[PDB]
Design a protein around this nucleic acid. Structure first.
Ligand SMILES: [Mg+2]
Ligand SMILES: [Mg+2]
Ligand SMILES: [Mg+2]
Ligand SMILES: [Mg+2]
Ligand SMILES: [Mg+2]
Ligand SMILES: [Mg+2]
Ligand SMILES: [Mg+2]
Ligand SMILES: [Mg+2]
Ligand SMILES: [Mg+2]
Ligand SMILES: [Mg+2]
Ligand SMILES: [Mg+2]
Ligand SMILES: [Mg+2]
Ligand SMILES: [Mg+2]
Ligand SMILES: [Mg+2]
Ligand SMILES: [Mg+2]
Ligand SMILES: [Mg+2]
Ligand SMILES: [Mg+2]
Ligand SMILES: [Mg+2]
Ligand SMILES: [Mg+2]
Ligand SMILES: [Mg+2]
Ligand SMILES: [Mg+2]
Ligand SMILES: [Mg+2]
Ligand SMILES: [Mg+2]
Ligand SMILES: [Mg+2]
Ligand SMILES: [Mg+2]
Ligand SMILES: [Mg+2]
Ligand SMILES: [Mg+2]
Ligand SMILES: [Mg+2]
Ligand SMILES: [Mg+2]
Ligand SMILES: [Mg+2]
Ligand SMILES: [Mg+2]
Ligand SMILES: [Mg+2]
Ligand SMILES: [Mg+2]
Ligand SMILES: [Mg+2]
Ligand SMILES: [Mg+2]
Ligand SMILES: [Mg+2]
Ligand SMILES: [Mg+2]
Ligand SMILES: [Mg+2]
Ligand SMILES: [Mg+2]
Ligand SMILES: [Mg+2]
Ligand SMILES: [Mg+2]
Ligand SMILES: [Mg+2]
Ligand SMILES: [Mg+2]
Ligand SMILES: [Mg+2]
Ligand SMILES: [Mg+2]
Ligand SMILES: [Mg+2]
Ligand SMILES: [Mg+2]
Ligand SMILES: [Mg+2]
Ligand SMILES: [Mg+2]
Ligand SMILES: [Mg+2]
Ligand SMILES: [Mg+2]
Ligand SMILES: [Mg+2]
Ligand SMILES: [Mg+2]
Ligand SMILES: [Mg+2]
Ligand SMILES: [Mg+2]
Ligand SMILES: [Mg+2]
Ligand SMILES: [Mg+2]
Ligand SMILES: [Mg+2]
Ligand SMILES: [Mg+2]
Ligand SMILES: [Mg+2]
Ligand SMILES: [Mg+2]
Ligand SMILES: [Mg+2]
Ligand SMILES: [Mg+2]
Ligand SMILES: [Mg+2]
Ligand SMILES: [Mg+2]
Ligand SMILES: [Mg+2]
Ligand SMILES: [Mg+2]
Ligand SMILES: [Mg+2]
Ligand SMILES: [Mg+2]
Ligand SMILES: [Mg+2]
Ligand SMILES: [Mg+2]
Ligand SMILES: [Mg+2]
Ligand SMILES: [Mg+2]
Ligand SMILES: [Mg+2]
Ligand SMILES: [Mg+2]
Ligand SMILES: [Mg+2]
Ligand SMILES: [Mg+2]
Ligand SMILES: [Mg+2]
Ligand SMILES: [Mg+2]
Ligand SMILES: [Mg+2]
Ligand SMILES: [Mg+2]
Ligand SMILES: [Mg+2]
Ligand SMILES: [Mg+2]
Ligand SMILES: [Mg+2]
Ligand SMILES: [Mg+2]
Ligand SMILES: [Mg+2]
Ligand SMILES: [Mg+2]
Ligand SMILES: [Mg+2]
Ligand SMILES: [Mg+2]
Ligand SMILES: [Mg+2]
Ligand SMILES: [Mg+2]
Ligand SMILES: [Mg+2]
Ligand SMILES: [Mg+2]
Ligand SMILES: [Mg+2]
Ligand SMILES: [Mg+2]
Ligand SMILES: [Mg+2]
Ligand SMILES: [Mg+2]
Ligand SMILES: [Mg+2]
Ligand SMILES: [Mg+2]
Ligand SMILES: [Mg+2]
Ligand SMILES: [Mg+2]
Ligand SMILES: [Mg+2]
Ligand SMILES: [Mg+2]
Ligand SMILES: [Mg+2]
Ligand SMILES: [Mg+2]
Ligand SMILES: [Mg+2]
Ligand SMILES: [Mg+2]
Ligand SMILES: [Mg+2]
Ligand SMILES: [Mg+2]
Ligand SMILES: [Mg+2]
Ligand SMILES: [Mg+2]
Ligand SMILES: [Mg+2]
Ligand SMILES: [Mg+2]
Ligand SMILES: [Mg+2]
Ligand SMILES: [Mg+2]
Ligand SMILES: [Mg+2]
Ligand SMILES: [Mg+2]
Ligand SMILES: [Mg+2]
Ligand SMILES: [Mg+2]
Ligand SMILES: [Mg+2]
Ligand SMILES: [Mg+2]
Ligand SMILES: [Mg+2]
Ligand SMILES: [Mg+2]
Ligand SMILES: [Mg+2]
Ligand SMILES: [Mg+2]
Ligand SMILES: [Mg+2]
Ligand SMILES: [Mg+2]
Ligand SMILES: [Mg+2]
Ligand SMILES: [Mg+2]
Ligand SMILES: [Mg+2]
Ligand SMILES: [Mg+2]
Ligand SMILES: [Mg+2]
Ligand SMILES: [Mg+2]
Ligand SMILES: [Mg+2]
Ligand SMILES: [Mg+2]
Ligand SMILES: [Mg+2]
Ligand SMILES: [Mg+2]
Ligand SMILES: [Mg+2]
Ligand SMILES: [Mg+2]
Ligand SMILES: [Mg+2]
Ligand SMILES: [Mg+2]
Ligand SMILES: [Mg+2]
Ligand SMILES: [Mg+2]
Ligand SMILES: [Mg+2]
Ligand SMILES: [Mg+2]
Ligand SMILES: [Mg+2]
Ligand SMILES: [Mg+2]
Ligand SMILES: [Mg+2]
Ligand SMILES: [Mg+2]
Ligand SMILES: [Mg+2]
Ligand SMILES: [Mg+2]
Ligand SMILES: [Mg+2]
Ligand SMILES: [Mg+2]
Ligand SMILES: [Mg+2]
Ligand SMILES: [Mg+2]
Ligand SMILES: [Mg+2]
Ligand SMILES: [Mg+2]
Ligand SMILES: [Mg+2]
Ligand SMILES: [Mg+2]
Ligand SMILES: [Mg+2]
Ligand SMILES: [Mg+2]
Ligand SMILES: [Mg+2]
Ligand SMILES: [Mg+2]
Ligand SMILES: [Mg+2]
Ligand SMILES: [Mg+2]
Ligand SMILES: [Mg+2]
Ligand SMILES: [Mg+2]
Ligand SMILES: [Mg+2]
Ligand SMILES: [Mg+2]
Ligand SMILES: [Mg+2]
Ligand SMILES: [Mg+2]
Ligand SMILES: [Mg+2]
Ligand SMILES: [Mg+2]
Ligand SMILES: [Mg+2]
Ligand SMILES: [Mg+2]
Ligand SMILES: [Mg+2]
Ligand SMILES: [Mg+2]
Lengths: 150, 117
RNA sequence: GGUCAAGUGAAGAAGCGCAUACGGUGGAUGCCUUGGCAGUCAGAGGCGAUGAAAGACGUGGUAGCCUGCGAAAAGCUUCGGGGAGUCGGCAAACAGACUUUGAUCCGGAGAUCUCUGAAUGGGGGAACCCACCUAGGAUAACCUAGGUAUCUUGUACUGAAUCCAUAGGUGCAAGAGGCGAACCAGGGGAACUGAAACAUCUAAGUACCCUGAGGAAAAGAAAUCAACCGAGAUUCCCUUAGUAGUGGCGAGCGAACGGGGAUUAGCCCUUAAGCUUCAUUGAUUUUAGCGGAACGCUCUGGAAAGUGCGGCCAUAGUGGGUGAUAGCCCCGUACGCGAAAGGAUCUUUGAAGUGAAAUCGAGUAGGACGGAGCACGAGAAACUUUGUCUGAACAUGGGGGGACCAUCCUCCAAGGCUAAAUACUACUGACUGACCGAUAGUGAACCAGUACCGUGAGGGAAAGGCGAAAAGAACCCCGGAGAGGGGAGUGAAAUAGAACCUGAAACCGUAUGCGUACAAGCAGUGGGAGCCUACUUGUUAGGUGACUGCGUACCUUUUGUAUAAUGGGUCAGCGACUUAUAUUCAGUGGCAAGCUUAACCGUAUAGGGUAGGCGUAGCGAAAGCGAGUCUUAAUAGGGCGUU
RNA sequence: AACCCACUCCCGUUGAAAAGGUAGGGGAUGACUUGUGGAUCGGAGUGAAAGGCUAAUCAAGCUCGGAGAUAGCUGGUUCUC
RNA sequence: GGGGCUCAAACCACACACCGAAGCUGCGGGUGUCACGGUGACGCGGUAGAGGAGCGUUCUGUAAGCCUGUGAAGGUGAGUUGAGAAGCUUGCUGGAGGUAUCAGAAGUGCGAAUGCUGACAUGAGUAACGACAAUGGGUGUGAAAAACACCCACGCCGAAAGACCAAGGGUUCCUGCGCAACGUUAAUCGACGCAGGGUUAGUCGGUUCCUAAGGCGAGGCUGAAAAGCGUAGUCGAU
RNA sequence: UUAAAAACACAGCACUCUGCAAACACGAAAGUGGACGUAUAGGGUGUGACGCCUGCCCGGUGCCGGAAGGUUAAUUGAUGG
RNA sequence: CUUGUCGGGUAAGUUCCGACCUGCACGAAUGGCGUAACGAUGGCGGCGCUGUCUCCACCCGAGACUCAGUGAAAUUGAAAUCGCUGUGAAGAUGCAGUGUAUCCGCGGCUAGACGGAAAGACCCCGUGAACCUUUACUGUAGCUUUGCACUGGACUUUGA
RNA sequence: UUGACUGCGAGACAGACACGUCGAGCAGGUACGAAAGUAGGUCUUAGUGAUCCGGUGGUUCUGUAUGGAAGGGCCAUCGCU
């Protein structure tokens, strides 16, 4: 904190409490006692200890009847209206779409759509699979989960 | 996440100053004096729940003495004669009959006196 | 019904206490934000004698101060954009004007550019004083435009002691000078502190001062390591490893070999890569802009974006603000377009210079004395460097492999140039935040490095909020043609009235109820009459508390405090166990005789990367041997270890 | 006498004044007093020498840095069971 | 301890009764450990200190959710619920935001540090109002005159308490209009606020000419660097 | 800015150093002061007008002179291992 | 030791002046003993003079006091803030017993509130700090000795 | 005559640690006695100083490319009012 070099008053004789600098943590405009610096809140999670949670999450979606499996999922030309109609046939509003590869047409649509996300098998994190009300996977994406998760 | 103390601190001083209602001078309107006054008041209250039981028994015994000597007996002899015969009435009830039911008190003193104690 | 005597004793408060209700002061709290802080991704990394950074004075219709400009002075000329208002802000009014024949406004280029300041014609107390020379023009007591610092390099003329020529002297050309937060390479170089004292040592080659250069710098192509197998310039990151060493062998300091990565590159002294500047081949960016989809009815309301019903757009749906909460009201957003003219980068292919030291390295390698550097403090002390003094050989030669010798191995010093990977941000742009929200965040949200303080260097504040919209209160009355009020008006709301959101506490008042003038002390607590209020009309609620039992504050420090031991006038706000990296134990999980990655790649929290670390075997100082091993003459005994 | 000084008493001590005032007192042509301009300074200056003075600060000035020096010493350390 | 006490209310023996604690018992609750499968028995003073379990505050996810102009946060009363930190419901004020639940992160809880900043008390309407030269009337103006202006009359200085240069200051100078603040009281007055005006040189003082102490100093000599000294010279009045 | 004195200075006295590029002092050095002086001068030290005087000790420590002899540095490198 | 002893001065003299010598512990340029003049210098004694005093009295101005105006300060845990004798962190307004006493100002005085002011300066402690001294330790500026370098010729003496 | 022996050592006493005290018995070699046997100093309890550093005698250890050496390790032992 700027300033605060010399003693405000002398050590003895003035009848005031001892001071050494005007920028002391006790004073009004002084510094912070344990002032923060930028740092990283990064933890370590084992490779196998992360894959066991994916296995546990995926097993709970099947038990809770949130996982929906379909034979391929694609759209022609990027149109939010076109993707909205196709999800209504499956009866899904707040859905996470998982595919083996995110097509450009499917990515452009559903980008502005509110409660819909399109992801990848290796892009699907623990948080998203718990957050959305349904998870819609394709057959190719299922055969890829068993490869990565054993 | 900086936390400000304004709302919680004020809500905590007002709790103490509400218990200091009716005290004199600074004991009811500044927190430093009122906090000490509320603690001392609670200290007296715990102690004086013990003393209330002592002060009332000393008052029942004094009244039974006054009413027994009107019938011709002292307190220490009346208690010895009540134990001797069978009677196990409280001192609180005995002091109530001395003031209100004076005829019933006489019959108890006469019953205790027949036990020659 | 009188008189006397005795007994008893309501009301009457100068002022105080408690409770309640209204005020005043005061500025907390809540909400808010034009201000800050920390990152990420880019930019471009300098400005200056063509006069800088920093300023003084001036400049407008009207006074001051900020912001722009510079006697051509809130501007002049040109291109390019657009498309209707404009004459900058505090900060308003009154005036004068400007223009769809294209203005204010934005961008490129040009012109002007006072005085001070490296300040450079000479001096000076910065913003002042005094000049000389050349050319042109006026006749009076000048004007206009150019020149006149110093040093270095080059060149021309010239010329002392002194004969020749040297020093020296003038005239021209080119360059330099000063400023800047950090990064880089060098010169000089502390102390507090730690070692629980202190000298060697540490702190530390840090702080600080000084000198050069660049957008990066430095270093760089083996007289290098290895170990009889090989590697292959420099720089940076992760390990080896807190190990080998070093050390009043104290406190401490601290490698390398060997591996895993980022980057990829070498070329010359029989003259080369490269670099710089001009001229041309193309590409791409930057300095401004243009288009940019989709909504109605109804209720409450001052005002719908909120309620209820029904729709539409989506490569655009958690943006900002519009009278309360908006994808479809506005500006934007995704996505497409766009440059007269400047800047920049990469690309051709031409010239010029440079690289450049000539010719393979001599006062050099080596040595002696005294110091520095190597993790290494003289130590068995190798290697580098040099202040003093010396001093080789010439490829059948020389240097290293940690005293030294022999044998082997590997290199060729005393001449040069080289990109990338790396460091930093005073400065510009965009995005982001389990950052702050006016005692916080920059000292600085507000005309802040200001006011103020100091001779000076220097130190260094306080101070935000009416309302949606000024609709900012016409008019009447009191008052000094006041200050301040009472009405009336505006507004949804003036106890939102300009010291204006909300408006707490300390502190100061007015009104009502009860208590208080024969009474002794931490002011309460237990019991308790009487009175007042309300209403459920008394086993109720609320306010007072006559009288009475008990009762010497809080914190700290102590064997011990009512202590006449410390601290506090009170209120409000702020104010003290944190973070990073290495570890040990416990709890709780994943894998399991195996577990786990670090740097770094990456589609970027996934996946790869198992170099490394720990475990599966110990004993011994070690060589070494191994379910054993050490001691020992000993398979004896004993120590440690083993199902 | 002016001017320079500061021996005594008293007042003042929250002062009219962070060193004064009223009464008295010493020198007063000299080793005098004084204006303007200048020179010497921090382990340094200056000193007819009191460790005096160097901007109300001197047994080592002020200011900014090392720097949040060190403090086996005092003080303080915030909700509940 | 006091009043008071003498065949005692003193002392010495014996006897019976009663009072007397938070001790023990009775009744109703809460908790720790152990045993058994909710009951039993046996505990529950406490500083330094160890162990266990919780409340509340700000931010992030849950949450493009839910609540809210038929009224959010905040402020101020009342009632009510827990063993506590505390929770909940409401009247008034306010006028736009808040965050159930379960998790995750902390600038996470003040009465003290002769603590820091602002506001306000007590002393107290008390000390003091700054040289003890000195004031008294009349008139005028004015909302209002002890203090302003004029007149009459007293006092004080006069080697100054009168005039004038220099330094220093910088509009304080004069006039018109004013009195909120400033003036240790009031003020119509003012060195105060607003607005105008006011400084005229061949001879006065500067500048220009010359030098003193001293400064700077081309070349120069010296020095790790910065730099020191100094010649020609050119600044510098007192 | 609580001590004005018996404290400091003083004229006079004495000792000692210095031959000039002086001793001495400030300066990493150039240089400057001493001094544009020259032993009747300059520096340091003590005493303190004037009068009468200033006694004994050279063992210690210092200073001056001597140089015979003992020890005695970098340097040198016989000899031995 | 000591107010030594003797003499003078006073009614009375631990001070003063003159001597004695038993100099705890004078002494000759850190000078010895004298000395005219001088000193806001130290000690003692007289004359004059007096409110210095016995012992104070009266008077005059400026405050103090009252009225009008303006308007501080240190201090402060909170106060419904008596005496005495005991007790007690050992000297009590606040504890115990007891005695006194209606409530509130103003002018005065300072006995107490271990009164206010300044984290005691005396004393001790800290493996604290400064500055000063020296034949404390370790260094070092300056001064000085010798070797080598800048640094040469000749003659002579002299050791290997 | 050399048991004031060499390697150990079951088990104890003391004790914060570092240290200290007693010791049967086994293996090697001994000395006295005819032999059973006794002898790991002295009737017992004081006569003592850690680590670092440096020196001396040994050593089937190590020894910075290799063979050696220097240096280091191990055992014994010297230098501290
Ligand atoms: Mg400072
Ligand atoms: Mg400092
Ligand atoms: Mg104090
Ligand atoms: Mg701050
Ligand atoms: Mg990974
Ligand atoms: Mg989406
Ligand atoms: Mg009450
Ligand atoms: Mg209250
Ligand atoms: Mg009455
Ligand atoms: Mg009252
Ligand atoms: Mg960058
Ligand atoms: Mg760049
Ligand atoms: Mg300006
Ligand atoms: Mg012009
Ligand atoms: Mg145009
Ligand atoms: Mg110039
Ligand atoms: Mg100049
Ligand atoms: Mg020029
Ligand atoms: Mg000039
Ligand atoms: Mg430069
Ligand atoms: Mg040191
Ligand atoms: Mg130390
Ligand atoms: Mg220490
Ligand atoms: Mg020390
Ligand atoms: Mg060091
Ligand atoms: Mg160096
Ligand atoms: Mg550059
Ligand atoms: Mg290089
Ligand atoms: Mg290398
Ligand atoms: Mg080979
Ligand atoms: Mg290479
Ligand atoms: Mg649009
Ligand atoms: Mg929005
Ligand atoms: Mg609103
Ligand atoms: Mg919107
Ligand atoms: Mg609409
Ligand atoms: Mg070569
Ligand atoms: Mg050469
Ligand atoms: Mg060499
Ligand atoms: Mg050497
Ligand atoms: Mg060395
Ligand atoms: Mg050593
Ligand atoms: Mg050499
Ligand atoms: Mg070499
Ligand atoms: Mg070698
Ligand atoms: Mg070797
Ligand atoms: Mg080379
Ligand atoms: Mg930026
Ligand atoms: Mg606020
Ligand atoms: Mg601020
Ligand atoms: Mg500030
Ligand atoms: Mg000033
Ligand atoms: Mg209306
Ligand atoms: Mg209101
Ligand atoms: Mg309002
Ligand atoms: Mg207010
Ligand atoms: Mg508002
Ligand atoms: Mg308000
Ligand atoms: Mg209030
Ligand atoms: Mg009142
Ligand atoms: Mg009343
Ligand atoms: Mg009475
Ligand atoms: Mg009464
Ligand atoms: Mg009383
Ligand atoms: Mg009661
Ligand atoms: Mg009641
Ligand atoms: Mg009561
Ligand atoms: Mg009571
Ligand atoms: Mg009591
Ligand atoms: Mg004590
Ligand atoms: Mg004590
Ligand atoms: Mg107390
Ligand atoms: Mg006690
Ligand atoms: Mg106390
Ligand atoms: Mg007291
Ligand atoms: Mg005390
Ligand atoms: Mg104390
Ligand atoms: Mg305390
Ligand atoms: Mg106090
Ligand atoms: Mg496990
Ligand atoms: Mg064994
Ligand atoms: Mg074992
Ligand atoms: Mg004068
Ligand atoms: Mg007098
Ligand atoms: Mg005088
Ligand atoms: Mg005089
Ligand atoms: Mg005289
Ligand atoms: Mg003079
Ligand atoms: Mg100077
Ligand atoms: Mg100093
Ligand atoms: Mg002294
Ligand atoms: Mg100063
Ligand atoms: Mg001073
Ligand atoms: Mg430090
Ligand atoms: Mg400190
Ligand atoms: Mg203390
Ligand atoms: Mg009983
Ligand atoms: Mg009981
Ligand atoms: Mg009990
Ligand atoms: Mg029970
Ligand atoms: Mg307990
Ligand atoms: Mg108990
Ligand atoms: Mg409401
Ligand atoms: Mg909030
Ligand atoms: Mg409430
Ligand atoms: Mg509310
Ligand atoms: Mg809002
Ligand atoms: Mg939440
Ligand atoms: Mg805190
Ligand atoms: Mg506290
Ligand atoms: Mg507080
Ligand atoms: Mg506390
Ligand atoms: Mg105080
Ligand atoms: Mg406080
Ligand atoms: Mg008052
Ligand atoms: Mg008073
Ligand atoms: Mg008074
Ligand atoms: Mg007065
Ligand atoms: Mg007066
Ligand atoms: Mg006065
Ligand atoms: Mg006056
Ligand atoms: Mg008049
Ligand atoms: Mg007057
Ligand atoms: Mg006169
Ligand atoms: Mg002037
Ligand atoms: Mg002035
Ligand atoms: Mg005037
Ligand atoms: Mg006027
Ligand atoms: Mg008035
Ligand atoms: Mg006034
Ligand atoms: Mg004026
Ligand atoms: Mg000159
Ligand atoms: Mg010069
Ligand atoms: Mg020069
Ligand atoms: Mg001149
Ligand atoms: Mg003159
Ligand atoms: Mg004098
Ligand atoms: Mg004096
Ligand atoms: Mg003196
Ligand atoms: Mg002499
Ligand atoms: Mg003398
Ligand atoms: Mg003398
Ligand atoms: Mg002699
Ligand atoms: Mg001698
Ligand atoms: Mg000699
Ligand atoms: Mg004597
Ligand atoms: Mg005598
Ligand atoms: Mg006598
Ligand atoms: Mg006398
Ligand atoms: Mg003599
Ligand atoms: Mg003497
Ligand atoms: Mg004499
Ligand atoms: Mg004199
Ligand atoms: Mg005399
Ligand atoms: Mg006399
Ligand atoms: Mg008055
Ligand atoms: Mg009283
Ligand atoms: Mg006592
Ligand atoms: Mg007492
Ligand atoms: Mg009490
Ligand atoms: Mg008492
Ligand atoms: Mg008691
Ligand atoms: Mg009084
Ligand atoms: Mg008095
Ligand atoms: Mg008093
Ligand atoms: Mg005191
Ligand atoms: Mg202190
Ligand atoms: Mg103290
Ligand atoms: Mg002392
Ligand atoms: Mg010691
Ligand atoms: Mg100690
Ligand atoms: Mg034992
Ligand atoms: Mg035999
Ligand atoms: Mg035998
Ligand atoms: Mg040692
Ligand atoms: Mg070898
Ligand atoms: Mg060896």
């Amino acid at each position: 904190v700027s300033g605060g070099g010399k003693k405000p008053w002398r050590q003895k004789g003035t009848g005031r409490a001892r001071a050494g600098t005007i920028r002391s943590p006790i004073w009004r405009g002084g510094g912070t006692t344990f002032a923060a610096k930028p740092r990283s809140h990064e933890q370590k999670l084992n490779k196998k200890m992360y894959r066991a949670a994916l296995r546990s999450i995926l097993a709970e979606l099947v038990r809770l009847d949130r996982l929906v499996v379909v034979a391929d999922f694609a759209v022609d030309a990027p149109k939010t209206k076109g993707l909205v109609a196709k999800l209504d046939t499956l009866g899904l509003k707040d859905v996470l779409i998982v595919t083996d590869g995110v097509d450009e047409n499917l990515y452009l649509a559903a980008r502005n759509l509110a409660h819909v996300d399109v992801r990848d098998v290796q892009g699907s994190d623990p948080v998203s699979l718990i957050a959305y009300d349904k998870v819609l996977v394709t057959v190719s994406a299922v055969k890829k989960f068993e490869e990565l998760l054993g | 996440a900086r936390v400000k103390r304004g709302v919680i601190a004020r809500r905590r001083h007002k709790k103490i100053l509400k218990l200091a209602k009716g005290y004199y001078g600074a004991r009811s309107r500044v927190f430093r004096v009122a906090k000490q006054a509320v603690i001392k008041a609670g200290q007296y209250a715990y102690r004086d729940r013990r003393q209330r039981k002592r002060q009332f028994r000393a008052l029942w015994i004094a009244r039974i003495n006054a009413g027994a000597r009107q019938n011709g007996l002292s307190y220490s002899r009346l208690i010895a004669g009540l134990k001797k015969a069978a009677i196990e009435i409280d001192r609180k009830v005995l002091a109530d009959l001395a003031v209100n039911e004076k005829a019933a008190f006489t019959a108890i003193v006469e019953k205790a006196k027949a036990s020659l104690a």
